[PDB]
Design a protein around this ligand. Sequence first.
Ligand SMILES: *[C@@H]1O[C@H](CO)[C@@H](O[C@@H]2O[C@H](CO)[C@@H](O[C@@H]3O[C@H](CO[C@H]4O[C@H](CO)[C@@H](O)[C@H](O[C@H]5O[C@H](CO)[C@@H](O)[C@H](O)[C@@H]5O)[C@@H]4O)[C@@H](O)[C@H](O[C@H]4O[C@H](CO)[C@@H](O)[C@H](O)[C@@H]4O)[C@@H]3O)[C@H](O)[C@H]2NC(C)=O)[C@H](O)[C@H]1NC(C)=O
Ligand SMILES: *[C@@H]1O[C@H](CO)[C@@H](O[C@@H]2O[C@H](CO)[C@@H](O[C@@H]3O[C@H](CO[C@H]4O[C@H](CO)[C@@H](O)[C@H](O)[C@@H]4O)[C@@H](O)[C@H](O[C@H]4O[C@H](CO)[C@@H](O)[C@H](O)[C@@H]4O)[C@@H]3O)[C@H](O)[C@H]2NC(C)=O)[C@H](O)[C@H]1NC(C)=O
Ligand SMILES: *[C@@H]1O[C@H](CO)[C@@H](O[C@@H]2O[C@H](CO)[C@@H](O[C@@H]3O[C@H](CO)[C@@H](O)[C@H](O[C@H]4O[C@H](CO)[C@@H](O)[C@H](O)[C@@H]4O)[C@@H]3O)[C@H](O)[C@H]2NC(C)=O)[C@H](O)[C@H]1NC(C)=O
Ligand SMILES: *[C@@H]1O[C@H](CO)[C@@H](O[C@@H]2O[C@H](CO)[C@@H](O[C@@H]3O[C@H](CO)[C@@H](O)[C@H](O[C@H]4O[C@H](CO)[C@@H](O)[C@H](O)[C@@H]4O)[C@@H]3O)[C@H](O)[C@H]2NC(C)=O)[C@H](O)[C@H]1NC(C)=O
Ligand SMILES: *[C@@H]1O[C@H](CO)[C@@H](O[C@@H]2O[C@H](CO)[C@@H](O[C@@H]3O[C@H](CO)[C@@H](O)[C@H](O[C@H]4O[C@H](CO)[C@@H](O)[C@H](O)[C@@H]4O)[C@@H]3O)[C@H](O)[C@H]2NC(C)=O)[C@H](O)[C@H]1NC(C)=O
Ligand SMILES: *[C@@H]1O[C@H](CO)[C@@H](O[C@@H]2O[C@H](CO)[C@@H](O)[C@H](O)[C@H]2NC(C)=O)[C@H](O)[C@H]1NC(C)=O
Ligand SMILES: *[C@@H]1O[C@H](CO)[C@@H](O[C@@H]2O[C@H](CO)[C@@H](O)[C@H](O)[C@H]2NC(C)=O)[C@H](O)[C@H]1NC(C)=O
Ligand SMILES: *[C@@H]1O[C@H](CO)[C@@H](O)[C@H](O)[C@H]1NC(C)=O
Ligand SMILES: *[C@@H]1O[C@H](CO)[C@@H](O)[C@H](O)[C@H]1NC(C)=O
Ligand SMILES: [Ca+2]
Ligand SMILES: [Ca+2]
Ligand SMILES: [Ca+2]
Ligand SMILES: [Ca+2]
Ligand SMILES: [Ca+2]
Ligand SMILES: [Mg+2]
Lengths: 333, 592
Amino acid sequence: IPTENEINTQVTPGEVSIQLNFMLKVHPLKKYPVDLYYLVDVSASMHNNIEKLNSVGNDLSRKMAFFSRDFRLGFGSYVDKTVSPYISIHPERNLDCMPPHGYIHVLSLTENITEFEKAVHRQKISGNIDTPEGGFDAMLQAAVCESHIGWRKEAKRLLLVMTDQTSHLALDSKLAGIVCPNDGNCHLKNNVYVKSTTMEHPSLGQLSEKLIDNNINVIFAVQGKQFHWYKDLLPLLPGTIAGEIESKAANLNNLVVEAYQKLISEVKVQVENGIYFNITAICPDGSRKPGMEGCRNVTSNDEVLFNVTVTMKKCNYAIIKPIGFNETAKIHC
Amino acid sequence: FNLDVDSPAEYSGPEGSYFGFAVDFFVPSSSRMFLLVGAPKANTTQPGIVEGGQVLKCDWSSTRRCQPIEFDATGNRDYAKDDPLEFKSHQWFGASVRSKQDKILACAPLYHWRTEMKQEREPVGTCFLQDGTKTVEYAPCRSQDIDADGQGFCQGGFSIDFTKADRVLLGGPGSFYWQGQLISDQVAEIVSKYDPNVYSIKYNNQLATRTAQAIFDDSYLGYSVAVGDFNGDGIDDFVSGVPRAARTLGMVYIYDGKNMSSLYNFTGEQMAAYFGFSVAATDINGDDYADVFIGAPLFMDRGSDGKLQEVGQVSVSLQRASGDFQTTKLNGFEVFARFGSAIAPLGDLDQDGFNDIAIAAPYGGEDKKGIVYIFNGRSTGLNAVPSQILEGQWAARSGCPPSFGYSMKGATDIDKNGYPDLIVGAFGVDRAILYRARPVITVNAGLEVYPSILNQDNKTCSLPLKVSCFNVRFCLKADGKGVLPRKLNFQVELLLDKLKQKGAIRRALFLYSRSPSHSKNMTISRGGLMQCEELIAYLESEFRDKLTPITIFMEYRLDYRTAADTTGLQPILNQFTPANISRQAHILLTGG
Ligand SMILES: *[C@@H]1O[C@H](CO)[C@@H](O[C@@H]2O[C@H](CO)[C@@H](O[C@@H]3O[C@H](CO[C@H]4O[C@H](CO)[C@@H](O)[C@H](O[C@H]5O[C@H](CO)[C@@H](O)[C@H](O)[C@@H]5O)[C@@H]4O)[C@@H](O)[C@H](O[C@H]4O[C@H](CO)[C@@H](O)[C@H](O)[C@@H]4O)[C@@H]3O)[C@H](O)[C@H]2NC(C)=O)[C@H](O)[C@H]1NC(C)=O
Ligand SMILES: *[C@@H]1O[C@H](CO)[C@@H](O[C@@H]2O[C@H](CO)[C@@H](O[C@@H]3O[C@H](CO[C@H]4O[C@H](CO)[C@@H](O)[C@H](O)[C@@H]4O)[C@@H](O)[C@H](O[C@H]4O[C@H](CO)[C@@H](O)[C@H](O)[C@@H]4O)[C@@H]3O)[C@H](O)[C@H]2NC(C)=O)[C@H](O)[C@H]1NC(C)=O
Ligand SMILES: *[C@@H]1O[C@H](CO)[C@@H](O[C@@H]2O[C@H](CO)[C@@H](O[C@@H]3O[C@H](CO)[C@@H](O)[C@H](O[C@H]4O[C@H](CO)[C@@H](O)[C@H](O)[C@@H]4O)[C@@H]3O)[C@H](O)[C@H]2NC(C)=O)[C@H](O)[C@H]1NC(C)=O
Ligand SMILES: *[C@@H]1O[C@H](CO)[C@@H](O[C@@H]2O[C@H](CO)[C@@H](O[C@@H]3O[C@H](CO)[C@@H](O)[C@H](O[C@H]4O[C@H](CO)[C@@H](O)[C@H](O)[C@@H]4O)[C@@H]3O)[C@H](O)[C@H]2NC(C)=O)[C@H](O)[C@H]1NC(C)=O
Ligand SMILES: *[C@@H]1O[C@H](CO)[C@@H](O[C@@H]2O[C@H](CO)[C@@H](O[C@@H]3O[C@H](CO)[C@@H](O)[C@H](O[C@H]4O[C@H](CO)[C@@H](O)[C@H](O)[C@@H]4O)[C@@H]3O)[C@H](O)[C@H]2NC(C)=O)[C@H](O)[C@H]1NC(C)=O
Ligand SMILES: *[C@@H]1O[C@H](CO)[C@@H](O[C@@H]2O[C@H](CO)[C@@H](O)[C@H](O)[C@H]2NC(C)=O)[C@H](O)[C@H]1NC(C)=O
Ligand SMILES: *[C@@H]1O[C@H](CO)[C@@H](O[C@@H]2O[C@H](CO)[C@@H](O)[C@H](O)[C@H]2NC(C)=O)[C@H](O)[C@H]1NC(C)=O
Ligand SMILES: *[C@@H]1O[C@H](CO)[C@@H](O)[C@H](O)[C@H]1NC(C)=O
Ligand SMILES: *[C@@H]1O[C@H](CO)[C@@H](O)[C@H](O)[C@H]1NC(C)=O
Ligand SMILES: [Ca+2]
Ligand SMILES: [Ca+2]
Ligand SMILES: [Ca+2]
Ligand SMILES: [Ca+2]
Ligand SMILES: [Ca+2]
Ligand SMILES: [Mg+2]
């Protein structure tokens, strides 16, 4: 009904006040600053993958700087919770390995790219027992720890998780005697996940919430058959995509760009919080889908709006977020 | 709906011991009854062991004293000089407790031993079983098949249960690269075949699952267990959750209790919902067919707005004589509350003829104190609307949330009032609470009005002048199952012509009272026929409105204080019984 002034939001209108059908215009800009964070499983099975990515990011920055005005790059490693039965707890325990660890943020986002190469080759490999690796804790930490990693409030915040096997689940922790659910807040003292042995892995609900709130788009880069695993989870984490690292590997740069042009090629909406809302799609081409399923292939230029029908039954403010975006529309008998 | 929440019995344990991580009833074969509470991180007297854990027996009557049960006062045994055999420190003893008459079985799922061939530390898990006098150890997963390739990380005792025929069922989620494993051994053999000097005891009539293909790796069979007949043989069959099976889609295996042959498979619906975290078996529709309840605490539901909300979900699968199941699902209510973390059969809580059940949301309610919902069984299945909601009364002491409801056990009548009771653990605050079932009273009320159609010019009665009059008669009887007082005191309040509010005039009043109201203390015998009482009430120059009927309304309320027993447990009225009724009267209009 009433539309706020001075816009200054990419979703139009930016604020509305209805008291009980209107259309809101989302429109992605072409040149987006980009924040790429490589979060990588450094278990044994990844020895080939680490060796590969020693000097490949240096090349990708070419394509990305061509895709994005600004481009910054960060790096962090993870393995598993450092507690039995996830690791062997013998005071010893065959080739050059580093000790296991929950998660270490090693390099904050920076434009100077050679720093990334120097950091990755300096990286070594650990090892544990159970095949799945506790990746979700690292994901949550890289998500909420905004200041430490250095996510820019303007850039498309891409978290590339690189692994080869399935990730651990929250209730898995119970085996280790860890039964205190994840609290979802940053717990890095010296760039080390100090709560790896005290809190459970984050559940998909907590992780989705933390990604959407911090506006992080996840890219699952995996190798083995477990790609399908991370693929079948995509419907549960909106604004996330998966890419298969093919056997020989080295498709990392091309994979992440193919994944990048797919979120610029999609604008999907999600509302948070007694009232029902009904959504219809308005893509460049004539297509009419429910809001939860946002248009795809969307050219960066073309406008894209959604209808909202508000019908209150019982006599606060709701928020309508286009996933992947940082600007939003707040809406207020 | 009949759980006493004003004065439940509260028990506490040492701070930081996770007192209340597992609870159970101890009922020896005509003897006193006790509570059992596990304290897995409790420090112990056994020398050189830190947070060995223990299991406390808590008195029922008089003081709420909890004394530990001595299953093993020894430290770590040595296999060779300065070569420890086992590592009881942080073994989490008491993390799994189950009782059966004189038998108490406790387990330490994080117990480690080095193995007899090399110097390692492998969490094979262990248990200690205690009957009348004897106390034996039971470690079916510490054997020759060591390391992850076998039973090295099996963590035997992660979940346990008994069968009707005194047979122990144990789950080991870490066997064969976390394919999980189930093991069933006769109590008599665990006793007889025990040997203090043999570390890998062999039991003759043992039943166990065989290692399988690698596709089943990291599935966590035995994460949770339950027992019940599901093939009509009389022998309790085995039920176990496999939360990581089917590509983290979860499953529930059911094996024949006679020879560990696969019987049935439940498969989850949502990935990573942990379908199979909790499991229970009980006949919920009184069909004498064990029904299966399966928890998925991390389930996410998509509601109106499309936003996925992690609320958890419980699947209620009713067994039918044919063999298959009639499955109905039941979502949570509060986000991140993990509805379905714990599932506890309660027996016939209200003693209505259908067993009931409790489902926990340990991380729900105000400030995440934890909640326990109660559901009543019906002929048609389970009533999906909870009849009672139990809330924790403690806040985050440190790190770990209260977790009220994470563990709980029912179906035992500890006070012997005819109704099963319930224990609820909250280990995050080191507490356990016993909620006792109040006896349910069913009340039949009657109300008659004669003559129903009044005649303004009748004027039969003589006011202590004359006025038209009629008779109002209220009857009452009550009875109930279990233990209750012989005389039940109800107070009945009657009002005349309610549809006309207080601000408006009234027309029908009582004779002896000259008032619209009538109260009466009424002492009716329990189980007898209807005690009735009738009184006269009279009714134009004082009111113009005659088109609005005259309602004669009656409400009744029993006296709880006088009906309570010696322990203070007050009776309660059936949940679905109107506390009031009404009849009507009208005036003859002109007519002729
Ligand atoms: C519920 O769901 C569960 C699991 O989801 C079901 O349980 C699974 O059932 C299947 C089918 O019955 C089981 O697979 C069987 O595997 C055996 C193999 O025996 C194993 O043990 C032998 C002793 O070590 C070993 O020799 C075998 O060798 C393996 O490795 C070699 C390679 O070296 C390989 O070539 C073999 O094939 C084996 O994989 C093996 O370790 C197999 O014999 C069974 O096959 C039958 O039918 C096939 C035809 O396809 C035939 O070729 C065989 O000869 C045999 O007649 C079968 O594939 C699986 O192990 C079970 N897993 C678990 C965890 O229980 C359960 O059945 C479901 N129940 C219901 C009611 O739905
Ligand atoms: C059962 O009994 C055991 C002891 O028999 C208790 O275990 C002790 O618990 C206390 C907690 O109150 C621990 O105190 C902490 O110690 C940390 C260092 O411990 C490490 O180093 C020792 C060797 O020096 C190792 O043995 C040990 O395993 C660890 O590797 C400190 O860093 C902690 O400091 C922090 O907390 C204090 C508050 O106490 C703050 O003031 C500090 O600023 C800092 O934040 C802390 O002091 C103690 O280490 C434990 N000992 C052992 C041997 O484990 C159990 O708690 C007890 N359990 C129950 C249920 O009763
Ligand atoms: C949500 O994200 C959007 C991003 O699209 C954001 O709006 C953008 O904010 C950035 C903030 O820097 C703007 O970028 C500036 O653009 C102007 C003109 O193009 C530049 O001159 C600015 O120069 C900066 O960068 C230089 C080096 O790169 C520095 O030397 C200099 O000091 C400046 O820091 C700067 O690049 C961008 O123009 C807007 N775009 C739009 C469409 O508004 C928005 O603010 C975010 N939402 C919230 C709530 O913050
Ligand atoms: C554990 O015990 C269960 C039963 O308690 C058992 O499951 C049953 O096994 C029997 C095998 O003895 C199965 O019976 C067979 O079924 C097939 C197909 O239905 C029939 O074709 C077979 O007929 C021939 O075999 C008979 C064997 O007695 C002959 O007598 C007959 O003349 C035929 O030649 C045979 O009847 C049965 O189907 C299953 N299931 C059930 C519900 O009965 C399981 O195998 C045992 N597992 C062990 C011991 O590991
Ligand atoms: C003016 O009002 C007076 C009363 O205020 C009224 O007198 C009534 O007369 C009838 C006879 O025509 C009486 O009828 C019986 O009354 C007793 C009450 O003591 C009832 O219990 C009787 O019903 C019982 O038996 C029935 C079997 O036939 C059952 O079906 C029923 O459930 C009862 O158990 C029966 O009604 C009546 O009692 C009196 N009134 C009173 C208060 O006693 C008079 O008729 C009115 N004026 C006119 C012109 O009628
Ligand atoms: C970008 O990073 C490189 C990598 O460290 C920096 O090169 C370093 O320069 C310092 C001098 O300031 C030398 O002491 C280091 O040995 C150099 N490191 C390497 C690996 O050669 C470079 O200075 C950085 N650029 C900016 C603008 O900060
Ligand atoms: C526009 O979107 C459609 C689907 O929404 C794309 O069609 C897909 O094309 C890719 C290869 O480009 C295939 O792998 C998919 O199987 C196709 N799916 C469907 C449903 O057709 C189409 O390619 C997009 N257009 C452009 C130019 O990329
Ligand atoms: C939204 O509209 C569709 C019809 O397009 C209808 O089926 C659905 O029930 C509506 N949702 C709500 C929450 O009203
Ligand atoms: C009488 O009971 C009904 C439910 O049976 C209830 O809705 C109503 O409010 C009650 N009336 C009074 C006066 O309490
Ligand atoms: Ca692992
Ligand atoms: Ca059976
Ligand atoms: Ca049944
Ligand atoms: Ca019942
Ligand atoms: Ca009782
Ligand atoms: Mg690995």
